[PDB]
Design a protein around this ligand. Sequence first.
Ligand code: ZPE
Ligand code: FE2
Length: 630
Amino acid sequence: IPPSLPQYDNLAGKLARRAVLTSKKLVYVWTENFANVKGVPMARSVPLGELPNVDWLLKTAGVIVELIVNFVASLPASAAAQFERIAAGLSGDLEAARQVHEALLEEAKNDPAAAGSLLLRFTELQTRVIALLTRVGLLVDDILKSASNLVDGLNRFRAVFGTLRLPEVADSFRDDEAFAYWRVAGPNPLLIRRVDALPANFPLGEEQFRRVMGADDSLLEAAASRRLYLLDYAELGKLAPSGAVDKLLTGTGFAYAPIALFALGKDRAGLLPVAIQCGQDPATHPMFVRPAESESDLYWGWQMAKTVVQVAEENYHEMFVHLAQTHLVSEAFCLATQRTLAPSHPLHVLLAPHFEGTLFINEGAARILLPSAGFIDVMFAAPIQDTQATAGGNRLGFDFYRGMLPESLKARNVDDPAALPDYPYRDDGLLVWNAIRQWAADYVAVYYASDGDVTADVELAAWVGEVIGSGKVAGFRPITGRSQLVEVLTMVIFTASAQHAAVNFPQPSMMTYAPAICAMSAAPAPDSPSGKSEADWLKMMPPTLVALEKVNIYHLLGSVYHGRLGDYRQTGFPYAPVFSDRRVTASGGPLERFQARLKEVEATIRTRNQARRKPYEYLLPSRIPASTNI
Ligand SMILES: CCCCCC/C=C\CCCCCCCCCC(=O)OC[C@H](COP(=O)(O)OCCN)OC(=O)CCC/C=C\CCCCCCCC
Ligand SMILES: [Fe+2]
């Protein structure tokens, strides 16, 4: 049976669906008082049908067990003794669970007709792997309680990896061009903007600019030729505390809201860092200017200033770009969808796959990552109550329309490949955005023939109402026609899939090594550009506990690829197609066209990567999950 809009469904359909929605609303319940994320709309609890499937669980547990084994193996034999039996037991039990899963799958295959008799056993396996994860929880608590015993000046930052290979950034982090390239190809491709005139509170002058870029360049010429780009972290607010923040677990930490200027040379061959101010007030933050190789008295001040930017970057990236603007946005769309679009509504069928695992992973962020003494309280400088409030405020202020990729690119004046040629997030992102848009256009056209079909759809009206109201999605507005609906669906889908991928999957290769990036520093911003030493810079590096949590959490969160954009098949048993409607699934139809377009996009991106200075692979469709689930 094809899905239907409520105004067209037959009566038995209409009453069945309104009763289903009355039921859904008892199961999927809004709160703004979820523990550790006050003010953000959340599910009160995760319904049974929203727990992760076995396939996700085995993937996630697999990575976690690899990390446990790696940790235990890095310990001295004496310390390892406390944990070896437990670690061996987790490995063996996970393997046992894989085998149960594989047996169940082969049993279903031997008699597909009898496969419904297996569903309790499939949920029993889900329960079992979740219980395995509870045991992991207990082991993590124990490791952390014994952190003192277990846990060029940087050897401790290598040691925490065990036998995991250090990422490339461990080699290249001090390099100026590499630093600049984070701005366009790193986990946070969103903050960088063109600058036409400098902020008043960033008094970089003509003479300083020419010192760096050459006597034949100028601020005026560079600005006018679209060669100046600014990173300004003012929006971090309380994520950049004024001073020292003393915590029990990590001692004294600092973070920052700096401003940094980058420029292209006249040949536009690449972005170069020009100047950094380590906070918003120039009266208390001197100007650091890019030093020449011979200026050994400026060298370490400049390394310190870049580390200041990178501290700000982890705070901005993780709390805003990643948690607030992917995870916590998709939370709202998940809840509105289940509460207001009947399961037989075609938009429910389309969107549900894009929220698989979202409620679960988000409850995990709040319960595990955000309480006092949790990962974020360890890894991020600000008091945890300030972090929670600031991330939440950022989610609440995120404008849905202004946040769409093309609008973002335009508002920041970074949408012109002629002016800023090397911007992989922009160029690959647009390919994926546009492919999704055509799919959304095609799919909408199946079910909505007129703008009348959009305005007369009472479920869609209720959905918009809940997204605006209970969901507190800023900038969302009434949907009055088909083209608008398409732009909306494109954004909801892109957000859930590609955007999350682009800002989540860089975590292992770019964020696991604390000297290259960390959301806390152990020292104030450099007080002068001149006369700093390696020892002054080393003082900024975090306590080892920070590094230990960092390598493990960022490896995990970027190593689970579950589901794939466009596949539209269940990702757990029985792995059936999402769509039944032959208008969607037919040969040469909307779905096949979307699938084929994504492979075209993949081929284009691979071609682009052969010619890039470094490959950018996060927006390869083959590496984009349909949902935000890790
Ligand atoms: C950091 C900023 C991220 C921002 C984005 C956050 C958004 C979404 C991500 C939310 C992710 C939520 C957390 C991951 C969820 C994993 C799937 C899951 O649900 O696992 C649940 C278990 C059990 O939970 P429970 O509450 O009973 O006990 C917590 C400890 N009191 O949690 C973990 O395995 C702990 C984290 C494993 C950390 C790495 C294992 C390290 C083992 C090796 C040695 C470790 C030494 C430390
Ligand atoms: Fe994520």
